[PDB]
């Protein structure tokens, strides 16, 4: 009989699992705080009633009649997966989960392997005991393909994957153990043993030593590219990436390209190249400024760390002094309680309590000095940043924006000159020939040239729109820098607020504990005076 994994069944499975591993008997098991789920042999026919488990780390559904997989997109934080030995025929629905590492699809109807490009980090995959037809299938997942097939997969999709068994597949019963060697040459001790067979190493060209040297080189290139990307973004000039793509957002440029395509493309290339080089110098200077600003900030946290540590060391020394005070006071308390001289005991105890209030006052004073020091440090650093780094970025952005403006103005002037020359050439030529195949493009050029004022206004609008878009992107980068710095300062100050609140709460709690303990000692010493009458 077909069934469903229901939340009543959910609780039943939770109870069985907790029994299996002696988990705390809590009926109030938070359903948003689930990590591992076992569903051993429920004969489960479908997967349902599991929404909300984005934090899942372990899961098991072996020994069931499940046959289809899909909608596992919402679960992207899974680690331990075991769904083998089911009615599976295809793999899909998991394209969003990258964090899984244990993939079990053993002993199913699996014949096509697909959907694991996103989870390149997988290291365990069981798809053995299947109906798989071709060995080279697996080759597609480790950056190796049979020679002679057009393969657009020039980027390997599985590197750390070192757990993979398909043993028992249909083709795996032919030419014993040759297919394993072939796949491994495209893919732990078994690997060393297979690599030592002469035919295994002779039959291919792309080995593992060279593969790993290339891997290290490629990963170094990737890391340098990522650092360059972060550099450019922190320069805030990333938004200008469409500046050279603006013309493809500028239709009037396409319309005007008809008049003289050759020199139009030539001037466009000159304009793009110069704009690119000077804008690049722009973000390079901005990057220097932002890097020194980052150093400024990091030294800010460093200085806060040293000064704070000084504060806690002084506070801890004073607190150790008062703990010694408490211990001597309690020792004398017990000694005189054996003595029973209540008057002197309570006198020394109020002496201690006044000392405790003194500790409260001095600790609050320490917090006050903390406030002065942190506030002065923050104001000084903010003024330093404003005076040097913020102003340098300001000037660099101003120079870069007006340099882009210089390029735009010169480009517009060159466009004006080319338009005037084309107009003059058309005016000269129109007086000799009046019949040539009624050319469509010739007629379009004639119409564009006749309305010379129309062309002038179109190019002027083109330049004004280009300058406006460039200026708006420039100001968007400037506002990005403004908001970034503002959020930095705001987070630092607010976090200082919560830190101050937390430390004051701790001080109040300790003073309250001291006072309550002192009162307990005094009250017991005094109550010891109520049996003697």
């Amino acid at each position: 009989d077909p069934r469903v994994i229901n939340e009543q069944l959910i609780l039943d499975a939770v109870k069985q699992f907790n029994q299996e591993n002696n988990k705390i008997t809590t009926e109030n098991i938070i359903l948003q705080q689930l990590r591992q789920l076992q569903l051993s042999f429920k004969n489960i026919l479908k997967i349902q009633h599991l929404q909300g488990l984005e934090r899942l780390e372990k899961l098991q559904l072996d020994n069931n009649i499940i046959e289809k997989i899909e909608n596992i997109d919402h679960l992207v934080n899974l680690k331990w997966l075991d769904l083998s030995f089911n009615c599976i025929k295809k793999i899909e629905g998991l394209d969003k989960l990258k964090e899984l590492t244990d993939l079990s699809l053993f002993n199913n109807y699996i014949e096509k392997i697909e959907g694991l490009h996103n989870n390149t980090k997988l290291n365990v995959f069981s798809i053995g005991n299947n109906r798989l037809k071709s060995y080279e299938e697996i080759t597609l997942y480790f950056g190796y393909k049979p020679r002679g097939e057009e393969g657009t997969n020039d980027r390997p999709e599985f590197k750390r994957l070192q757990v993979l068994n398909v043993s028992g597949n249909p083709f795996t019963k032919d030419k014993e153990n040759e297919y394993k060697n072939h796949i491994i040459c495209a893919i732990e001790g078994d690997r060393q043993l297979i690599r030592q067979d002469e035919q295994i190493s002779n039959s291919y060209n792309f080995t593992t030593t060279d593969y790993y040297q290339q891997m290290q080189a490629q990963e170094q290139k990737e890391e340098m590219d990522r650092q360059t990307l972060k550099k450019k973004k922190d320069a805030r000039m990333d938004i200008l990436d469409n500046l050279k793509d603006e013309y493809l957002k500028i239709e009037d440029l396409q319309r005007v390209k008809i008049i003289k395509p050759n020199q139009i493309n030539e001037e466009i290339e000159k304009y793009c190249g110069k704009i690119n080089d000077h804008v690049v110098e722009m973000q390079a200077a901005v990057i220097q400024k932002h890097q020194l600003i980052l150093q400024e900030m990091s030294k800010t946290e460093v200085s806060y760390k040293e000064q704070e540590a000084l504060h806690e060391k002084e506070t801890l020394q004073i607190l150790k002094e008062f703990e010694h005070e408490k211990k001597v006071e309690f020792r004398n308390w017990e000694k005189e309680a054996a003595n029973g001289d209540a008057k002197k005991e309570e006198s020394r105890l109020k002496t201690l309590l006044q000392k405790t209030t003194s500790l409260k006052n001095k600790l609050m004073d320490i917090e006050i000095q903390l406030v002065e020091e942190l506030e002065a440090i923050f104001t000084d650093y903010d003024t330093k940043k404003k005076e040097t780094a913020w102003k340098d970025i300001e000037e660099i952005i101003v120079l870069g924006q007006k340099k882009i403006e210089e390029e735009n103005v010169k480009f517009y002037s060159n466009l004006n000159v080319i338009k005037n020359k084309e107009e003059a050439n058309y005016n000269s030529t129109q007086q000799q020939q009046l019949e040539e195949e009624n050319n469509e493009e010739d007629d379009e050029k004639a119409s564009l040239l006749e309305n010379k004022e129309q062309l002038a206004q179109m190019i002027g609008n083109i330049k004004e729109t280009l300058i406006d878009s460039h200026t708006k992107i420039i100001l968007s980068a400037q506002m990005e820098l403004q908001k970034d710095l503002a959020e930095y300062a705001k987070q630092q100050k607010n976090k200082m607020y919560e830190r101050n609140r937390k430390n004051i709460s701790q001080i109040i709690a300790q003073i309250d504990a001291y006072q309550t303990e002192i009162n307990e000692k005094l009250k017991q010493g005094d109550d010891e005076s109520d049996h003697e009458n």
Binding site: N63, F106, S126, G128
Partner: protein
């Protein structure tokens, strides 16, 4: 884990085939039923009627 799951699969298939064996054999033996009793009782009734 995979080795023991396959071992479980082998055990389950073995026990299932044994269950099918027992079902088939015992139900084949059950294929002969009480119809002989009805035939013999109709026989006794008919014999007594012929005697009358």
């Amino acid at each position: 884990e995979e080795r023991k799951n396959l071992h479980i699969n082998e055990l389950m298939n073995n026990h299932e085939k044994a269950f099918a064996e027992l079902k088939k054999y015992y139900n084949d033996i059950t294929a002969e039923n009480l119809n002989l009793i009805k035939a013999h009782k109709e026989k006794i009734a008919q014999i007594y009627a012929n005697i009358q």
